[PDB]
């Protein structure tokens, strides 16, 4: 049995992350 | 297995996150407030250090109002200037958030939060306080007007 | 089960929620205070900051820390099949109840509207500090006098048998807690209990903010670990009865990570404090990206044990990615399957609380959001999303199973997690955006001045983000009232069968006798040596090189060294304790 | 099915959505323009108001009015089992395509950034008015030359047999439409087609706002009626194959109500116009609470046919209220069951669009919300909630069934309605609250000035409600991209079986041969005599007693009687037409 | 049956809705704009009719700005006053929304929207325009300051 | 067969209405 579903669920994670995080990071940079 | 794939995914994610925050903290220095110590008695403050752009701001945070000049909750600063903001409360732990910029420092009694921002875009920059400092906290702010 | 142990567990399941009813009441009143609709500066004689002290303390100090010992009594007595000790449970409950009553007095009357973090030099009434210390320190007496034995006895009698996952989880959890009480039990007892009832006249208002976030942060993972022992052992059995908990060693590994890496991380709460030498805040924004790893291992183990379980009862779904997640009992009644509504509406909120926490820790990025309204977005979707919803599910389940009542109003129950998840979405979303873009600050009445369209401190831009969260407040007030009706109807009546202490415990698809872990000795020692080698620097600061004088104590309504080496040589000597075990 | 009729239907299913792709594109760009993030005053050479003319026209004039004739071709040819007429379908599609191309030229180039309502004296290029008239008036040629015969033939040959519900619905619908083209086809052809290409030099800018909302309002129910013939005949069969459509006479009654009471109601769009004598606006805010009744009869028939169907495949659920609604195929793939995702995510949005419309009509309460951002909350959750989602479902289904392709990417399809419902929630919620409490107005760039933190017209309070809707815009952009990928993959390839014209048509739990209804004659006459006895007053105003001079025509970038009696003696003479039938 | 129960529920609902809107429209008169006709040529306007409270406001709405006095996008009015607001566009169909109050009237060329509001609570009342009136619509407002 | 479910679903309607409607009506009254 190969948990082929959670791997794709992760791929969905950490591309939801690394988008939320990158939005707040860009707020960080855009603030001078 | 598959746990190794999940783990290398999480690891490449967090390594990317961390490489970028260390990049932004070292290059294009956005330095989190660190320990600064020269003398810093600090119940006062504002000096036009290098004239046109450089400044040195001393926003002592008394209980339930800020103190940008000798008792003046607001302040006016020429555009483009690059202030050197020092913050130190008088009595309790005081937040100093300066809404326009990323200047978000605590004013802990007996400490001197240093951070160096520049006000590129004119306007008014409200200096709000977030940490709790007793009743009469919700009426604790003051502006840094950059005309 | 016994006759008094059932009463102990029932008190520790009902008293915390009977108290959390005020926490939720004032949570709603706060999302009304902050959104500028209940302006003034008080309500029913509980002003905003005192009701906030309550909504914080009641909810994360007297609710969890009591439900945790209740549910752990349960799960350990069960998984070890041992009978609990009454003369120990009794004094444990006695201390937690007396402590919570002493903390809730002098917090309702108004003697300690300090806050749930009691950031000095903003002292409170000694009955708040002694109360909270007695509350906390009185939940160890179970751990150390009840089921450290009877697990040393259950182990040696087997003797070649791993410790069950459900009790290895509570052991990692309470080892964590035993360690991370040392900091705050030093801070309180030696800085704030002396400063109140004035014996000392000074305080180090940075050393008491450190030495606090050496307790404020391991306590999130102290709460999170029982939610995780649920997600590991009870979730794959409230899904179809063929569920298995893929990779038991992976669960044990995640617990060992929360043991080692949850203690040294607490400096990432004070990123903006000016004393602590930077480049230590960086090491702790590294250990934070390290302790956010075991939760991304749990997001794999408990998303596979959700896949193995589902694709075991639906052989059609075999080798199909994404089409399960639809065959899960999202809103099923009828027999340990309402609980999936809670576990899933908790896992979604945790999905969001995780990225929000990862952000919050990116120590640069912690300037954008520190003490804005973002942080309630973080710790509502984490605490009140997963930890609270899993604790709600287990409350309903245990109050049922150990009193006899099947479960009453089970439909209202099943609905509650979705009203809760959607209230928390409609509310955390508005607050997170309004805390990132317009700096909507945290712990501020913000509805009396910063949103009074008449006050000279108006700040108009904040009204949108604060009036689009009142609906989240309302919606999760309804979502909690549902679960509460269900719990009260379940506790009340009527007894139908024998009051047992069951628990659906899933078991180990991939099992392994791995002895590198399973060894809490030589991992507890790691967790103690780390988190000292990571607090020597910040405690060197904030003690010397960090402050230039000490501060007297200010009430909330009036403008009025060795203390480190002790906690150091206390942690490093807790090793004899946790090694003799 | 034929070989060219399949091409006709395919064009009228694909060309409208291939055109609506721009409607959705600029919808997203608008919720970015209005929320002050894409400021400026243009993008890719399509400024805000011209892109708004497009997002309005394309979406409710060239998308629906074409998909309606396509799907009606389908459902009538099927339910009557008759073969469509090609030499009629061909000229029908030819006129609709030429009309839409003439309207989309001179709306893309910028000759008619007037708006989708073309409120005079703000005239456009004649190729917009002749284009829209030709578009509309060219969808009647099917009704009157294709399936008024072949339904007069199918009827008389039986001859004692009710007209099928699916074709009685399209008959009520197109009778409605045949009637309510008279107003706008008089207004355009006699006021705006003369004023453009100047032949007249004046206009009655109140009589052309009436005589428009005598078409703008029956057209919402013209769209709504095919959504309802779907909900009646196709929903209880895409739920379990034992579904039955409780109370066929109740469906026929709801259609007869939308026939009589949808025409006289159009004065409740201009409640605040100053000409029309008040106490006629009151009669129409009464007929509005009357035409909102048949939709509350449909909310009963299509919530019982949802209960009868479910409790027929789950005899366990018998006599259980509230526990079904959980056994419905919310997110099931596998065979005319994805379509339930669309029908349900449309029914929820319609639940909200209904109360919002009821509010909007409470003519007093129409001062709070008129032309605020509330109204896009009304007609996005109605149109783009139910009418659009049901049309999406039937597009996928028919493009499948009459081309051969089973359905491709069916999972993306099934997801699309939920991204859509949640985008519409996250967006309509922010906009409705921000239009009620801070008057966030409608049809305003509002991101260049009213949200430019530099412009002297700043109005700060609006930024919250406008920056908490961008996520709704994004979310339903993804939700439509999903369905669009699914539709393109379905249309493309590959043919597997015979291209038939099937439709799951449920059938009449409670059937009745009721001849009081089933009689479109003597109910069409009612609908025509009413809606004239309810426009004599407002058309007496706005023609005399309402205006004091006539207005020349102004371009959008520059400060530059018998016409009633004709439409009156035209409606009242449409009776010979619709009686000879 | 059950359809009769659903129908009596819908009917009691809508009858309640309608009884209340007619109540609010007749008692405590919140009158929707009706037809008014005396002379009304109207390119002008503001008169202090009864001195302290009553007024008569003539907000002609030219293309892309309002006209509260003889070309003055803003206006100042004593508190508590009860204005009589007449509105009439010059060229095209113009919205006149007065954000504080429920004055939401169209300015149709050749018509005179009458409505009578009173400004009980001081402040500033932005007179925004919602209906579309061409480019340069988004810059069409003006204040009724009530100090 | 008695559609006992839709009657309760209606009771839920028109008490969701008559709450939304009453909020906007109270905005109407509160505006002078
Ligand atoms: C009130 C104040 C007004 C303002 C508030 C506006 C919002 C109001 C509520 C909006 C929802 C109302 C509609 C409720 C019913 C929806 C239909 C449905 O839920 O069916 C589910 C599909 O679930 C949904 O996703 C719909 C949720 C809304 C849209 C979410 C959009 C996010 C992305 C899409 C998510 C879809 C998956 C894609 C992931 C990539 C289908 O469930 P099923 O398992 O497939 O059912 C199969 C069924 O046939 C059966 O055979 C099975 O056997 C199952 O075991 C039984 O399933 P079930 O039929 O019982 O369905 C259970 C469902 C419960 O649904 C919910 O209600 C959760 C929705 C959120 C909470 C809603 C609260 C409103 C009141 C409570 C409603 C519950 C009933 C009480 C009615 C009185 O299970 C779930 O859906 C679990 C949730 C999964 C998604 C979670 C994410 C939701 C929030 C999204 C993000 C929001 C924040 C946005 C900001 C960030 C930007 C992204
Ligand atoms: C129990 C309670 C808590 C948990 C758990 C928690 C977890 C984290 N936190 Fe935190 N926190 C911070 C960083 C983190 C990080 C990195 C994690 C990590 O542990 C989070 C990792 C979580 C995982 C990365 C989530 C993924 C795993 C789940 C399981 C995914 C679900 C899997 C799916 C597939 C399941 C299927 C179902 C659907 C979802 C698909 C920071 C950062 O600097 C601050 C202060 C910032 C500011 O300056 O004060 C902070 C502040 C707080 C406070 C503030 C107290 C006071 O107001 O100041 C509280 C109470 C709190 C509680 C909790 N926190 N936190
Ligand atoms: C197809 C498109 C449309 C439909 C349908 C529609 C229905 C209504 N409308 Fe409307 N509308 C107005 C009043 C109504 C009323 C009373 C109804 C009624 O037909 C609505 C009745 C709907 C029912 C009362 C809903 C209940 C029935 C459903 C079926 C419930 C679901 C049942 C559940 C149990 C199913 C189970 C699933 C879950 C939900 C539980 C007013 C009022 O004065 C204005 C202008 C105001 C302002 O001054 O301009 C207006 C403005 C518009 C515009 C503005 C155009 C331009 O921007 O100005 C458009 C395009 C439009 C389209 C549509 N409208 N409408
Ligand atoms: C194969 C195509 C791949 C294309 C992917 C494109 C990704 C683009 C990035 C956009 C991000 C949004 C993600 C949307 C998912 C789209 C996938 C989809 O709808 O189809 C996949 C799947 C059905 O296909 P499959 O399972 O392979 O078919 C089996 C045949 N017997 O769908 C399903 O039926 C399973 C989906 C789960 C539905 C969840 C329902 C509950 C509501 C809340 C969900 C939250 C939990 C899920 C979390 C992970 C989401 C993937
Ligand atoms: C009997 C107790 C009555 C108490 C009612 C109190 C009303 C207070 C007003 C608050 C309004 C919120 C409404 C919440 C509904 C609470 C009802 C509930 O959770 O329990 C009822 C029902 C299960 O009970 P029952 O079906 O009688 O048990 C059968 C035994 N074999 O629950 C169910 O399982 C059915 C509920 C449907 C779940 C919907 C899941 C999909 C998500 C979106 C739903 C939208 C569609 C439903 C619309 C109508 C909602 C009722
Ligand atoms: C971060 C934060 C962004 C910060 C601000 C952003 C705007 C910056 C943008 C921004 C920055 C500026 O400087 C700026 C300046 C001037 C004008 C404009 C802007 C501007 O627009 C907002 C996001 C907050 C959280 C994140 C919302 C989370 C919502 C709830 C808490 C729970 C719901 C979501 C969870 C996760 C469910 C996931 C499960 C399932 C799959 C559903 C699908 C949801 C989707 C994620 C796939
Ligand atoms: C009207 C409108 C209210 C007007 C403004 C209100 C704040 C007035 C309040 C208000 C008025 C003031 O004058 C004021 C003045 C000064 C300070 C404060 C205020 C103030 O707070 C807001 C509501 C807008 C709509 C309504 C939101 C609808 C949300 C989406 C469009 C779709 C989601 C909901 C639908 C219906 C799903 C239903 C199906 C299922 C059961 C889910 C449960 C949802 C629940 C309804 C049961
Ligand atoms: C039920 C609906 C709830 C609502 C509407 C709500 C509302 C709020 C709001 C608006 C805040 C921010 C106050 C501020 O920052 O000044 C807050 C703070 C907080 N909430 Fe709640 N809350 C709810 C439930 C909960 C629950 C269930 C928990 C935990 C079990 C919780 C834990 C906290 C904590 C710890 C704080 C921080 C208080 C502080 O900063 O001292 N809340 N709550
Ligand atoms: C897909 C996501 C969509 C978004 C983000 C969106 C966005 C918007 C917004 C913000 C408005 C208000 C513009 C204004 O008032 O000035 C608007 C108007 C409108 N929308 Fe969309 N829309 C979407 C889809 C649709 C759909 C699918 C339809 C109908 C099929 C639709 C029909 C309309 C109509 C008729 C208007 C009125 C335009 C006008 O007032 O002239 N929209 N849209
Ligand atoms: Cu100073 Cu809070
Ligand atoms: Cu004047 Cu729009």
Residue numbers in the entry:
A (entry chain F), F (entry chain C): 10 to 41
B (entry chain E), E (entry chain B): 3 to 149
C (entry chain D), D (entry chain A): 6 to 565, 572 to 592
Please share excerpts from the published article on this structure.
We found a dimeric form of AaCcO with a novel binding site of the native quinol (VII‐tetrahydromultiprenyl‐1,4 naphthoquinone, NQ) at the dimeric interface, which could allow NQH2 to be a direct electron donor bypassing cytochrome c. Surprisingly, subunit I (CoxA2) contains 14 TMHs, two more than the canonical structures of CcOs. The AaCcO dimer is formed via interactions of its major subunit CoxA2 while this is not the case for BtCcO. Interestingly, two quinol molecules (NQ) are found at the interface with the head group orientation towards the P‐side. Each NQ molecule is deeply buried in the hydrophobic groove formed by subunits IIa and coxA2. In particular, one carbonyl oxygen of NQ is found to bind to Glu39 of subunit IIa, a residue presents only in A. aeolicus. To be noted, the NQ tail is buried inside one protomer while its carbonyl oxygen is proximal to heme b of another protomer. The edge‐to‐edge distance between NQ and heme b is 15.0 Å. Thus, only the K‐pathway does exist for proton transfer in AaCcO. However, structural superposition of AaCcO and TtCcO suggest that only one oxygen diffusion channel exists and forms a V‐shape in AaCcO.
Cytochrome c oxidase (CcO) is the terminal enzyme in the respiratory chains of many aerobic organisms. It is located in the inner membrane of mitochondria and bacteria, and catalyzes the electron transfer from cytochrome c to molecular oxygen that is reduced to water. The cytochrome c oxidase from A. aeolicus, AaCcO, was previously discovered belonging to B‐family HCO, and interestingly could use both cytochrome c and ubiquinol as electron donors, which is a unique feature as a member of B‐family HCO. To gain insights into the molecular mechanism of AaCcO and also to understand how AaCcO adapts its structure to keep stability and activity under hyperthermophilic growth conditions, we purified the AaCcO from native membranes and determined its structure at 3.4 Å resolution by using single‐particle electron cryo‐microscopy (cryo‐EM).
